[PDB]
Design a protein around this ligand. Structure first.
Ligand SMILES: Nc1nc2c(ncn2[C@@H]2O[C@H](COP(=O)(O)OP(=O)(O)OP(=O)(O)O)[C@@H](O)[C@H]2O)c(=O)[nH]1
Ligand SMILES: NCCc1ccc(O)c(O)c1
Lengths: 341, 56, 226, 277
């Protein structure tokens, strides 16, 4: 040959086969062989303890507080409701400019809330405002695509995900993208910050997930294996593992240090897509939300299903476990949130 | 397409030169973190309704 | 306590019913198609901006134009799987991006997530089309040679004083989009073509009529009648 | 004998089928809230309850009295006939409502989604049930229908309760479904115009099939009994008790078939499939 582009394609495929070999070197066993001697968690039957109403349309996002008591909810009625999950009372009801909100975050101090959507703008509102009503405080602009997820690091650092296939770390005050992460081919749909804020993963429509180093701005690992777009992702509570759910009706658990897929969670009776995933407090239990109005509870160690959550009357759009593990919340397209334990 | 091919090769070379651990160790650490906190997960072992703020 | 519960549940019931009763319409189409001009006009004459809320005969509508600017607008559109109808607007006077619009329309009509979303086709900028037709400088056959063998349909209802060349042009564009719309079939959704310009004022009665037809056909196919 | 025991076993099968179908409908509604979610489903539940009452209350006693030949419960049967007149009239009544419901959802779809609030649904269900109970119980306990248990009502009561219970609902239902036919024919013609233009009868047959099935089962199932119920007390040309009894069974047969004709939407099918598996 001689044309460096075809030689780069050749060295690319050569690298993918070196990667497959470096993967089979550490591919000595399977998770099922390791966990065949463990005992099943038994039947887990959670029940709806609360139902939070007020929302006029299908809910798309929720986020627990650090106190495991407050949470924010987003509906396509242009609202952002803050709930007191103990008493099911609403503490604030912030109307939003754009009604097509898709994400919301909760500052670990409880001082700020975030939200964004088709406006490609992340609006921060100070809940600890000093006079009248909670209103807009900051507003981060710059993305050429729709904001799909955003999460605080502290009260002044937040990472966002957008439809321009890139992620960015922002300084909320200055509004500048302090760091840019590029490399995804399709729309990046979800991000999850490590428990130590140091790393985060992102799942895009190129059927790939990427682990990004927050402080250095480089992509550390790229995982593939799904036949469709990955829609959701979340860290294992330990910090060295994460789970993904995709449109191909399958969930997959990847490890960061082994740099390959570890386990696949699927059933031939589950055919709908998947919208949200979250680990238990110990990471032993993996909860996944399906379009079939149900929530499938997988045993994160044995890939066996341990329970079902049939309590919503429409598509479950989001879910989330408290940080203390005391309860799990589920937001669905029925304009209702349900707490389970 | 000349810049994206150099970028694809350099990204694959950076991601390729990582050192990976055995799956056995990854599962042993997961099992250790699991059973080290298994008795404290209310969603796995249901806690009596007395210390449940939504059941008391 | 009890009266707080009574006032809350009945206000929340009326607001839930109202949101349930507002018909969301997604506006799609290439740029340079006057989409923003149609939304701006509706904001003016009934009540530009990304969003619009307007009422016809005590019937609420919510018109949305998405400016995310990509190709596989899956997540930016599969979150809007419940709109009543999609208003696809096409700049009929741009003779070379029309195949691009046709291809995009084909991808929309056969979309996996819109199998049940009916589309209202607005063939916008008819006045410019008539200008180009009377000029006779850029002919469609040079881009679409089929137009040479095309015959004006016998069912055409031209407006008073319409040049047969203009009638043939606008009905040719209509049938070019109908050839895509009629393949899929399956009766799950339909396309309602309309010849429109940006200054037309009844462009609310058309959306009203056709949302009503979409609901009629949904109710028919629900009772297995149609 | 062979005929007597065969009639007994077939009738028991008929009753059991009625009970199973209608209890399945009510259970499929109660178990799954996404079927109870809409409003049109309320009326179908009303229908299922009407048919379940027909079953559990009216049918078995008439079957036993037909087999044994003598009415054993005695002083009961006054009530029985009242119950009969009631249940077999909330059924026809309910069909009427369901039919009108569909019309409102096809001749004015916008006004429908606005005006039909579950309050109006309950008002309609209430109208059906109260018309039934009123017109049924009150003349029995007041002994106005009377001038083995004597089911011969009376010439004036026959015509009165018949005109109400049958001839108004059948008029409303024929008018409604023929209006829906006009509309469906219109829409098919429009789609055919567009599709023929694009490419340059079967779906009409489908419309005919479904409307004919619905309206024709109801009529061919209930109408003979009611033209008899009209003529017989008048003609006290005439027919016998056994024929009147089999045509009665046809009337209650519609009560068996109603679920399969009014509750086999795809989602209903899947709810049945997930219940029984
Ligand atoms: N003469 C004439 N010009 C029109 C008509 N409709 C739209 N235009 C022009 O076409 C241009 C394109 O419309 P835009 O406002 O850009 O809307 P769009 O191009 O479809 O989408 P955006 O570019 O995002 O706004 C507008 O600036 C109008 O001036 C029309 O009916 N007649
Ligand atoms: N099964 C017959 C019960 C019945 C119901 C209504 C009538 O009007 C009537 O004459 C008789």
């Amino acid at each position: 040959s001689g044309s460096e582009l075809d030689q780069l394609r050749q060295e690319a495929e050569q690298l993918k086969n070196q990667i497959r070999d470096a993967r089979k070197a550490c591919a000595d066993a399977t998770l099922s062989q390791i966990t065949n001697n463990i005992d099943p968690v038994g039947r887990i039957q959670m029940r709806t303890r609360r139902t939070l109403r007020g929302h006029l349309a299908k809910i798309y996002a929720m986020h627990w507080g650090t106190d495991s008591r407050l949470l924010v909810s987003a509906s396509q009625d242009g609202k952002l409701i803050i709930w007191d999950s103990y008493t099911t009372n609403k503490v604030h009801a912030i109307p939003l400019r754009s009604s097509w909100v898709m994400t919301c975050a909760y500052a670990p101090s409880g001082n700020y809330v975030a939200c964004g959507g088709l406006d490609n703008i992340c609006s921060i509102y100070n809940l600890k405002t000093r006079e009248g009503n909670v209103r807009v405080s900051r507003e981060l602009a710059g993305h050429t695509g729709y904001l799909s997820c955003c999460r605080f690091l502290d009260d002044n650092q937040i990472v966002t995900s957008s439809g321009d296939t890139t992620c960015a770390l922002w300084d909320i005050e200055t509004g500048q993208q302090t760091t840019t992460f590029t490399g995804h081919t399709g729309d990046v749909m979800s991000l999850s910050l490590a428990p130590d804020t140091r790393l985060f993963v992102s799942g895009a429509c190129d059927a790939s997930a990427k682990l990004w180093d927050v402080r250095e701005g480089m992509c550390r690992q790229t995982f593939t294996g799904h036949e469709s777009d990955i829609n959701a992702i979340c860290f294992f509570p330990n910090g060295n593992a994460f789970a993904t759910g995709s449109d191909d009706a399958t969930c997959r658990l990847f490890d960061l240090r082994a740099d390959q897929e570890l386990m696949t969670y699927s059933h031939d009776n589950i055919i709908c897509g998947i919208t949200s995933v979250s680990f238990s407090k110990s990471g032993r239990l993996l909860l996944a939300g399906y379009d079939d109005f149900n929530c499938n509870v997988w045993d994160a160690l044995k890939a066996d299903r341990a329970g079902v959550l049939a309590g919503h009357d429409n598509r479950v759009s989001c879910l989330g476990v408290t940080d203390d593990g005391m309860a799990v919340a589920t937001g669905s397209w029925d304009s209702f949130l349900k707490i389970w334990n | 397409s000349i810049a994206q091919a150099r970028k694809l090769v350099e990204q694959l070379k950076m991601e390729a030169n990582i050192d990976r651990i055995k799956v056995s160790k990854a599962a042993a650490d997961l099992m250790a973190y699991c059973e080290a906190h298994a008795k404290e997960d209310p969603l796995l072992t249901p806690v009596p309704a007395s210390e449940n703020p939504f059941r008391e | 306590q009890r009266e707080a519960n009574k006032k809350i549940e009945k206000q929340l019931q009326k607001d839930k019913q109202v949101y349930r009763a507002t018909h969301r319409l997604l506006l799609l189409g290439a740029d340079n198609s006057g989409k923003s001009t149609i939304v701006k006009q509706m904001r003016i004459l009934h009540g530009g901006i990304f969003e619009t809320k307007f009422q016809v005969d005590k019937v609420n509508f919510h018109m949305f134009d998405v400016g995310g600017q990509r190709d596989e607008r899956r997540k930016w559109i599969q979150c809007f799987n419940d709109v009543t109808a999609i208003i696809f607007v096409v700049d009929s006077s741009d003779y070379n991006r029309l195949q691009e619009a046709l291809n995009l329309f084909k991808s929309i009509w056969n979309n996996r997530w819109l199998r049940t979303i009916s589309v209202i086709l607005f063939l916008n900028k008819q006045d410019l089309l008539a200008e180009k037709v009377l000029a006779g400088k850029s002919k469609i056959e040079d881009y679409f040679p089929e137009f040479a063998r095309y015959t004006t349909p016998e069912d055409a209802t031209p407006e008073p004083g319409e040049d047969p060349r203009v009638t043939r042009a606008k009905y040719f564009i209509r049938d070019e989009f109908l050839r895509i719309s009629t393949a899929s079939g399956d009766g799950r959704h339909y396309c309602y073509p309309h010849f429109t310009c940006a200054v037309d004022t009844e462009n609310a009665r058309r959306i009203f009529n056709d949302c009503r037809d979409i609901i009629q056909r949904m109710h028919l196919r629900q009772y297995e009648l149609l | 004998f062979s005929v007597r025991i065969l009639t007994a076993c077939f009738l028991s099968l008929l009753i059991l089928s009625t009970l199973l179908g209608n209890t399945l409908v009510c259970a499929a509604v109660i178990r799954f809230r996404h079927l109870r979610s809409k409003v049109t489903n309320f009326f179908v539940i009303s229908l299922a309850v009407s048919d379940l009452l027909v079953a559990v209350l009216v049918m078995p006693w008439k079957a036993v009295a037909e087999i044994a030949g003598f009415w054993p419960f005695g002083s009961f049967c006054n009530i029985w006939v009242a119950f009969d007149i009631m249940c077999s009239t909330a059924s026809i009544l309910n069909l009427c409502v369901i039919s009108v419901d569909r019309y409102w959802a096809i001749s004015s779809p916008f006004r429908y989604e606005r005006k039909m609030t579950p309050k109006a649904a309950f008002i309609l269900i209430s109208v059906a049930w109260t018309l039934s109970v009123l017109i049924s119980f009150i003349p029995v306990q007041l002994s106005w229908h009377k001038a083995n248990c004597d089911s011969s009502l009376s010439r004036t009561y026959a015509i009165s309760s018949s005109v109400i219970s049958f001839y108004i609902p059948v008029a409303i239902m024929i008018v409604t479904y023929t209006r829906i036919y006009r509309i469906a024919q219109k829409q098919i013609r429009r789609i055919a115009a567009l599709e023929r233009a694009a490419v340059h009868f079967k779906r009409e047959t489908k419309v005919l099939k479904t409307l004919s099935v619905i309206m024709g089962v109801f009529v061919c199932c209930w109408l003979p009994f009611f033209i008899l119920n009209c003529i017989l007390p008048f003609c006290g040309f005439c027919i016998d008790s056994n024929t009147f009894d089999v045509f009665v069974w046809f009337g209650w047969a519609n009560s068996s078939l109603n679920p399969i004709i009014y509750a086999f939407n795809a989602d209903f099918r899947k709810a049945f499939s997930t219940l029984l598996g």
